[PDB]
């Protein structure tokens, strides 16, 4: 991946110059927000499975998606969808702790959209499940870290769409 | 930075980072003020640091500027000064990042391959980095010098 | 050819041709004149070689030209002589290339399943090549005959 | 057995330090469904860039008769 | 100390390349006869050999003068030749007095060494030795040796050497080319070491100097590409079969999977997918999965797919879990999809055995990987990596000091040892001279002579073996029906069963010894000594065995116990070296412990067992006691009854 | 034809010199130079 | 791949014809120039590293390519680029010795352009570096072998562009 | 593997001495026998199938080895045995060309006994078959070249015992 700190360092390096105060303010801001990010990551880690179950119940269960004819029908495909959501939550947590969306563009949105198109996995339903994940984690973590995690979940959502 | 290292280690095992990794992240994210002031202090004093380092090196290796030497000629000499400055910039990058990744990805991997192709002796480069280390640490407080020395040592160890 | 094989092995080790390989190819290029002379001798009298070898084959393997035989009749005998001419042409290719790469690529790779799908006894084809080798050896000098016999025997071995 | 046809570029990240011979890193291939998740994760963890993926073998949304 | 050994076999890295080795290895790595290419290289090299030897002769004869010219051009202010063991701008002559005697010696030695290795390279027909030992010498000697000075010396040596070859552009060109290679390689900067990073946290990272790689035999690498000629694709597929199946089973047995080969040569599947599907195939299943327990199968699979053996305890643990869960497909998928596989072979390259010379090697799996890479690996059934890795982490095993093969079966009769080559099972362990093997007494545990040294000779009663003693009087010490005939004969036959394991066939018994014992002329000890020294004992138990196997079996029969360690083994083995079989028997039967345990009237008997022997006897279903190694629940009638 | 014999031919014994005290005995060598 | 002699063998084989005069003379021509090929390949091997050094010196160095923001900036990029040039020189030597450019197409120009486009390696400056290699080798091996090698170096350049 | 040149060079080098008279004597013997050894190797390669056929016919066929219960009985075992005979012929050729039996030590006799003792291949029958191969090759290449190959075939045979 590619952190916010390393993002500032990379912009400086590509310019070939030292890190000016204008770019050093971004570094200071990221340094300040360490405690919130680490706490949010710990909270999410302690409750990942519960988050996924709650989001699935909110967004997917008792719908045509999970009835016969829906991609979430059958046991194996249900488990595959749950695994996808687990990976999404973990990678969103990674990007939140990093302060950058590069890991999402690198290890999530890399051939995933076209894989889903090939398999006919409904993009809208997946985005809905990610929105439910966002709501559950925000309700579990807080407003500030909730929004700053919803940014990265939204990055994933807009990449899939 | 250490955050990226933690995330890489965690993803390689397909798990959330453990408690210890997050605690290390917290400690690093707290020492940021010292890292930032070290980077700034090294930044504005690039010219003096490079001047002391280069005079020391070319006192150590007069052959480099002597006829037939790699640095003989104003163009080559200026390129060497450019290299001093660039590696000092890399050191500041490493200090801010909290690890050697910005240094290593930019100016250590393949560095022997590059300088061999330019006939700049790698032992000349390690001596250059040593004198740059001495000059730069001379311009820092004792605690800041202790903090920023291991980055110079890492460049030295990689160089040879 | 020899050049292709040497280059392919060099690629397999990701290295330039060694002085020994440069020497083998030097010898190959120098012997190009002799191998081209042998190929010219073979191609000049291809018709006589084919005719005599086919007649000798029919003498030695009457069943092939009998009812229930693959070569039975005028047309099938004509195609059998055609195959003999094909293989003599491939032998000339091998002679000029200094290697059996053309022969393997054109005539021998998957030859057993080719003739098995046609109901042709492969041992009889090997015998026909043997007769062609005998006639060709009788048609030129012994020193040239050995070099031609190397490729003739390669064809025979890949059919026996 | 469903198969994905995938086109991807996966440059080596260790070539300079290992000094191992250059290899072609841009490839199109068929990967079975059962290994495509691991393969995709591996490629993206390499720094690779997946260019195109299609369902070469199989049909979308089939419940019985996979192998 | 270290608690286990993976074995150690002779390692022969290539020091440098020569033309015959190059050609013959090129043919041999492809499993074929030398063809026109390699044979032509050999012919040209052999033809040039006379000239090359002429060059070598003239240079060795005049090496003194060439080195002297170099030393005179390079040094100033004295005579460099007082002790023998184009111009760079910075060149300046070096002062002999200032430069120092040690460094002057190294200068002259290096010049002569350069000329010597140049002659070596001329004869070998390849400059590889020069490149190997000269690329990176500069940085080795910059700080105590002038590079400009060395360059000028080499130029002078080159000129002087070529001066002897006005013959024509045959000798001169070769000398000049080899000296030019030497010059450009001495001028070369040191290349970076080849780094083999650990694929995970349980495997260490390593690096290898590039000169080591340059010397070793180069591994031929096969890569399937769409544009290759058909013959090249055939060679690549044959290499894939040689790698995965350890030999060309298509050539040998016409065994092949045709559709997989068509797919891979079309580019439908990559070489990686071809490897995955081939290793899952029933051919591979039958050859390298069905014959083996999973523990050995995974080691063979690591050989076939990654070109290396397991690297650590954690790795074998992880992959044995994988094969336990999902069997052969899971194992193959895990290996092929590993980051390590893609790091080395990618999508196109056929996997290759890495091993010594191709990259930095680890000490921890050295011997095991040596064994694994042998073509005899399929015939080792006992796992070698899990066993050795586990034994690293544990104390020394219960095992003979010279190895597991030196432990015979603890059966009634027969000297049965594992054969080193038959189903290889060797388990070397480092027993130093002072270890003592823990033995299990056949009798009351507290009578073990370790804890109770005065218990020696205490008969074990019902807990141990039957003991035969000449306690009763001997007959005739006239009348018939003298009862002293049955006991003495029972003891004689017991002694035969003890020394030989079982009774002999008719005509084999040492009748003179028997009558001389029955007449009170000798003692039981003397009679068993005669039995042990008999030509029959020599033929049966001494002659057919490794010396130390014979000694160990002898010790078990005569002292009723295995040897404790290197002290007893070494003394008997040394006697075997100096005197021979009869003296070894004498030493065993005249030893103090024999006298203590057995007097002049007791037939020897089994006094101790190894843990392995006792387990063999007492761990079978019909002999295993109910209370051993399990919870014994007391059964009580239910209270409601 | 007989020239082909190398391993089957008459062996050509090679000179291998008996090893002698190396420089690690230098001090003792000096002592040997001062013991006469 | 195929050499210039396998080339004529294949040309005759497609028509099922024996080797006639127009093929025999081409084989003669290849065997006449083979010694020059061996010598040129030997020289190039003896000076491959120096050839690449000199080519890079007068083509890429002291340009925006090596400046920050240029694709040769950073030591890893520089090492990779010179390694690519080493490979190009060696493969052009192979094609020179064979007398044919088939090896270039099958083992150099297959995915190379796609790989560069995915990576962002500048094609134009790659072509310029290879042209500098052509100049250096031509000055080192003589006009005849220089031109007959520049043919294959230009073949690589045209394949990349 | 090591050839004769490597053995001589290493003997010279371990003593720090130039190539002396005895070394040069052995090297020139190697170089002088080289052409005829190459010719013998070429002849053997051209006749490997026939050599193995005749050796098998002389030594193995119509015996207890090929009948039910014999180690060569089934077709797979027969093919494996003639393949092993081809191995022995090829590696004897390698040893002859190299002028040293090191290839036989490291590539053949390493675990030859492991393999055959584990599979229960009859050693005496193998030695008889290899002697038959030696006799057939000698009849085909000549008496002196036959001796040159026979030293190495006997080396393998003695390794089997
Ligand atoms: C008629 C059937 C064809 C024919 C046969 C033929 N075979 C041989 C010799 C052998 N045949 C075998 C075959 C097998 N042994 C096995 O164990 C198995 C599987 C059960 C098979 C199929 C073997 C091993 C031999 C070798 C002889 C031996 O027993 O040791 C011959 C003799 C060939 C010769 O020249 O010696 C013949 C004639 N031949 C034909 O032409 C018919 C088409
Ligand atoms: C005729 C020679 C005798 C005979 C042979 C026989 N061998 C096998 C099986 C194998 N032989 C080998 C040997 C080698 N493989 C190598 O790579 C090399 C080094 C160059 C050697 C020497 C091996 C490894 C095997 C098994 C695996 C493989 O196929 O490669 C068999 C089959 C045994 C079986 O029971 O399956 C046989 C029959 N048998 C005789 O009776 C002849 C005297
Ligand atoms: C009854 C024996 C036990 C039980 C059942 C139970 N299940 C759910 C909810 C779901 N069950 C499934 C399972 C399947 N759907 C399929 O299509 C198939 C494949 C043929 C299976 C096996 C699913 C997907 C759901 C989610 C809802 C949905 O299908 O839309 C519930 C309610 C869940 C909840 O808590 O809200 C229950 C009660 N529960 C028990 O305690 C019994 C042991
Ligand atoms: C769940 C919210 C939705 C859903 C999911 C679903 N996905 C698949 C199959 C796959 N999903 C992936 C995705 C990824 N691979 C990765 O490496 C990552 C990056 C972190 C992701 C997100 C892949 C590659 C596959 C195919 C390979 C495999 O499944 O192992 C399925 C099953 C499809 C099928 O036909 O079996 C399902 C059900 N489906 C829905 O309807 C939800 C909206
Ligand atoms: C025969 C009627 C015609 C013909 C055939 C032909 N095909 C090829 C090459 C290939 N054929 C295939 C097809 C398959 N491979 C598979 O595994 C399967 C799936 C079960 C199929 C259907 C493939 C993949 C190839 C390419 C790789 C390979 O050669 O195996 C050739 C050779 C082409 C070449 O240029 O070498 C030929 C000759 N050709 C005709 O003219 C007939 C009309
Ligand atoms: C259970 C009744 C007893 C017991 C078992 C036990 N086993 C292990 C570890 C291993 N067991 C195996 C077994 C096999 N390998 C094979 O190939 C097969 C043939 C199908 C078998 C059964 C192996 C290989 C291991 C090692 C696994 C690893 O690498 O970790 C353990 C753990 C040992 C350890 O140190 O982790 C245990 C506990 N132990 C008892 O006390 C029971 C009597
Ligand atoms: C007879 C039905 C079969 C048979 C037998 C046979 N056995 C041997 C050799 C030995 N037999 C033993 C057996 C034992 N030792 C013990 O301690 C025990 C329990 C008391 C037993 C059963 C041993 C150890 C040997 C080897 C030592 C010795 O023979 O003294 C042979 C001779 C093998 C040889 O040449 O060494 C034979 C022939 N053979 C058959 O074919 C029958 C089916
Ligand atoms: C006691 C805490 C536990 C226990 C012990 C127990 N041990 C045995 C038998 C033997 N103990 C040893 C041990 C050693 N011998 C040595 O030389 C050394 C090295 C200094 C040691 C540690 C041996 C070898 C034996 C076998 C008999 C012999 O002494 O020669 C027993 C008896 C087992 C039986 O079935 O008779 C017991 C009971 N048992 C427990 O339950 C305790 C936890
Ligand atoms: C100075 C301490 C030493 C020295 C230097 C020297 N360097 C060059 C030329 C170049 N140096 C570089 C370096 C880098 N590129 C990178 O990406 C990195 C990491 C940020 C580094 C350090 C490059 C690329 C060049 C060539 C590019 C160009 O020409 O612009 C020279 C001149 C060489 C010449 O002219 O051929 C010199 C002299 N010389 C010494 O003696 C010191 C040890
Ligand atoms: C140098 C003149 C220019 C340059 C080069 C450059 N290339 C890369 C990366 C790669 N280049 C290759 C090369 C090949 N792939 C093939 O199949 C073959 C055919 C024989 C070749 C030559 C590959 C595979 C890579 C990827 C890395 C790997 O080794 O696997 C880079 C690095 C790009 C990056 O982002 O790291 C560079 C710098 N760049 C320029 O600007 C020059 C004009």
Radius of gyration of chain E: 36 Å
Number of domains of chain A: 1
Number of strand segments of chain A: 0
Distance between the termini of chain E: 62 Å
Structural class of chain A: mainly alpha
Ions, cofactors and other ligands present here are: phycocyanobilin
Helix and strand succession of chain A?
A: HHHHHHHHH
Shape of chain A: elongated
CATH architecture of chain A: Orthogonal Bundle
Cα-atom radius of gyration of chain A: 18 Å
- The CATH homology group name of chain A: Phycocyanins
The largest contact between protein chains, plus residue counts on each side, is: E-H, 49 and 52 residues
Protein structure class of chain E: mainly alpha
Amount of beta strand of chain E: under 5%
Provide the helix percentage of chain E: 40-55%
Q: How much of the polypeptide of chain A forms β-strand, as a percent range?
A: under 5%
Please outline the major beta sheet of chain A.
none
Quickly count the helices of chain E: 30
Report on this model:
The structure is cut from a larger assembly and holds three copies of chain A (161 residues), one copy of chain B (160 residues), one copy of chain C (160 residues), one copy of chain D (67 residues), one copy of chain E (641 residues) and one copy of chain F (36 residues). Chain B is mainly alpha-helical. Helix content of chain B is 80%, strand content 0%. Chain C is 79% helix and 0% strand. In chain C, helix 2 (19-44) runs antiparallel to helix 4 (74-97), helix 4 (74-97) packs antiparallel against helix 5 and helix 7 packs antiparallel against helix 8. Chain F has one helix and no strands. The radius of gyration of chain F is 21 Å and the shape is rod-shaped. The structure holds phycocyanobilin (10 copies). One phycocyanobilin sits between chains B (64, 70-71, 76, 79-80, 83-84, 86, 106-107, 114, 118, 120, 124-125, 128) and G (61-62, 66, 73-75, 78). Chain D: This is Phycobilisome 7.8 kDa linker polypeptide, allophycocyanin-associated, core. Chain D: It comes from Synechocystis sp. (strain PCC 6714).
Labels describing this entry:
part of a larger assembly; 8 chains; E: 641 residues; mainly alpha; two-stranded antiparallel ribbon; 30 helices; 2% strand; F: 36 residues; 22% helix; binds phycocyanobilin; thylakoid (chain E); repeat (chain E); phycobilisome (chain E); lyase (chain E); Phycobiliprotein ApcE (chain E)
What's the short story on this structure?
This is part of a larger assembly, with three copies of chain A (161 residues), one copy of chain B (160 residues), one copy of chain C (160 residues), one copy of chain D (67 residues), one copy of chain E (641 residues) and one copy of chain F (36 residues). Helix content of chain C is 79%, strand content 0%.
Write the layout of secondary structure elements.
The structure is cut from a larger assembly and holds three copies of chain A (161 residues), one copy of chain B (160 residues), one copy of chain C (160 residues), one copy of chain D (67 residues), one copy of chain E (641 residues) and one copy of chain F (36 residues).
Chain B: H1 2-12, H2 19-30, H3 32-44, H4 46-60, H5 62-65, H6 74-97, H7 101-107, H8 111-117, H9 122-138, H10 142-159
Helix pairs in contact in B: 3-6, 4-6, 4-9, 6-7, 9-10
Chain C: H1 2-13, H2 19-44, H3 46-60, H4 74-97, H5 101-108, H6 111-118, H7 122-139, H8 142-157
Helix pairs in contact in C: 2-4, 2-8, 3-4, 3-7, 4-5, 4-8, 7-8
Chain D: E1 3-9, H1 15-18, E2 26-32, H2 33-45, E3 49-57
Antiparallel strand pairs in D: 1-2, 1-3
The complex binds phycocyanobilin (10 copies).
